[PDB]
Amino acid sequence: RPFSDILTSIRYWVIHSITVPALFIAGWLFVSTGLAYDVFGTPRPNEYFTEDRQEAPLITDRFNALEQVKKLSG
Amino acid sequence: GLPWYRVHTVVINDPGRLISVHLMHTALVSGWAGSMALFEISVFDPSDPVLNPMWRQGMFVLPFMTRLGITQSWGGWTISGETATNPGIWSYEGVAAAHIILSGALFLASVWHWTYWDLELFRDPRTGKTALDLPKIFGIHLFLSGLLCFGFGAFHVTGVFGPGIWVSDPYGLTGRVQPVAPSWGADGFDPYNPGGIASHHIAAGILGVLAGLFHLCVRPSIRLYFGLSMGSIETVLSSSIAAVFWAAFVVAGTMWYGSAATPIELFGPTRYQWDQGFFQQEIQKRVQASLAEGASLSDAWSRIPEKLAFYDYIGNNPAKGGLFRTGAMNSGDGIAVGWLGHASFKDQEGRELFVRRMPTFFETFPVLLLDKDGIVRADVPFRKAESKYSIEQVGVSVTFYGGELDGLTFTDPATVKKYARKAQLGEIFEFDRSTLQSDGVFRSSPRGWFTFGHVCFALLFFFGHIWHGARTIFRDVFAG
C-alpha cells in the first residue's frame, strides 16, 4: 500500500485530525491533574522532606521493603 | 595450501587423526595436572594450618584434591595438622604420579591411533566413504556419562564405598571429610547442603542413563535431521562449546558467591562475608554471650579462637588484590603470626570509640573513630594538614583485650595512631614481612583468580560458539 494514497485519503485526514488532539489533551490532563504523580509515585515539589525526615531517604532492607517505603514516603 | 589459522582443519574428515589429537590433548591436561600437583606439594608449608592455611599460600590445585577426601601426604604431614595414620597408596604424590602415568599412556595411545588412521570401523558398510553416526555416538557417550555420574553420586560422595566429601561448620572453624547422606526434600536444593550434591548426582546419573538408552533405541526425525544438520560434525562442536561456556559461567558464579562445593576452609572467605559483617557479627555475638555468663571482658575475649578472628581480616578478601599483583597472599602482607587482640579505643572522658572499617571497594580509606551514637570524635587528619580533632587534641587511648597483648594499655599518640590505622583493616595481626620480603600490598586469593580466568574463558567461548555456529549454518556459501 503506497504512502501517497493513504496520505491523500480524506478518511485518514479526518480520523487522525480528531484523534491526535484527543491524545494530546489526554496527556495534558494526565500530567496537570496530578494523576502522573500518584500513579508513578514521583513526589510533588512540596513533600520531598516530610517533617519527620529532613534528609534524603535510604532503604536498608531487601525483603521487608514495602512498609519501609511507606514510612519514607508521605 | 592452508593459512596459519586453519592448519588443524585437516582432521575434520579423518576420524583416526581426530581420535589421536583428542588423546593428545587429554594427555596434555593430565600432565599439567600431575606437574602442577608436584610443584604444589614441593612449595607447600604445612607448619601452621591455623594462621597459615593453604589458601593463603597461593595453593590452587591442592584444594580440589582436599575437597574429595585426599588429606594425607607421604611426607607424614597432614592437612589437619597431625601426622595421622599411614598415608596409603592414595596421597597427593600418589595422585600426581597417577596423572603423569595416565598422560604418558594416553600419549602412547595417541601415537598408535595417529599411525593407524584407516579402519573399517569408521567406514560405512553401505558406501566406502567414511561416515559417523553422530546421534548414536552421542547415545553411547551419554550412557557412559550417566553411569559415571550415578556411580559418583551413590558410592563416592555417599560414603557407601568411597570416603565422602569435605564438609565444615557454617563459620569455617572445624571441617573435614565425611560421608554425605542424600537429602530428597526441598532443603536439598539450597546451595549450602552437601546432601543436595549427593541426591543431585544420583538423580542426574539415573536420568542420564535413561536418556542415553533412549537415544540409543530411537533415531532422529527428518525435519530435525535437516534443520539442525546433524550429518555434519561442526554442529556438534558449536553445541559443545555452548554447553561448555554455560558450565564455565555457572562454575564461576558458584565459586564467587560460595557454595557447599567451595568451603572457605580451603578456598578462602568470600567478599560478601566481609561486606555483611559475617565474622564480625559472629565474634560480637559470641563475646556478648560470654560476657553475659559473668566472665570479665579480657576473659571473654580470650575465648575467641584465633582462626575465627583471622577470618575477620580485610587481607583475607579476594576482592582486594590486583590484576598484576602476582604471587601468593603471604607475599602481600607477610605471614600471620599470632593475634594481638581486640583493640578498644576510649577517649579521655570515657566514651568508647570504634574505627570505621574500610569498605571493600576503596583502597585508601581515611581513618575515623566513631562514637556509639555515630558522630565523628577523632580522626587522623590528611598528611601535614590542619588538625582540630586529631589524636593529640582528643588524646584517645587504646587497650587490648584477648590475644597476645591482653591487658596492656597505651597512651602514646604515635602508637595509638598506628594501632587505629591497623584496626581500620579489621582485627589487628602481627606479620613477619621479612621472610618473603612482602611488598605490603594485598593480593587476590585463589577464589578470585579462578573466577577471573573462568569468566574470561566463558566470554571467549561464547564468541567461539557464535563463530562456529555461523560457519555450520552457512556451510554451502562458506565452501564456495
Binding site: - | 595450501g1 593459512p3 588412521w117 599483583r325 602476582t326
Partner: protein, 38 residues
C-alpha cells in the same frame, strides 16, 4: 601400515603475515612488560 593420508596439506604465510606477527608480538611486549616488571 595405513596407506598415505589423502587429506595432507601444508601451511603457508607470506611476508605480510610475518611482519604482522612480529609487530603484534613486539607491541604486546612493550605494552605489557611495564606491568609485568611492576
Amino acid at each position: 601400515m595405513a596407506r598415505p593420508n589423502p587429506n595432507k596439506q601444508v601451511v603457508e604465510l607470506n611476508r605480510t603475515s610475518l611482519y604482522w606477527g612480529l609487530l603484534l608480538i613486539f607491541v604486546l611486549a612493550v605494552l605489557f612488560s611495564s606491568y609485568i616488571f611492576n
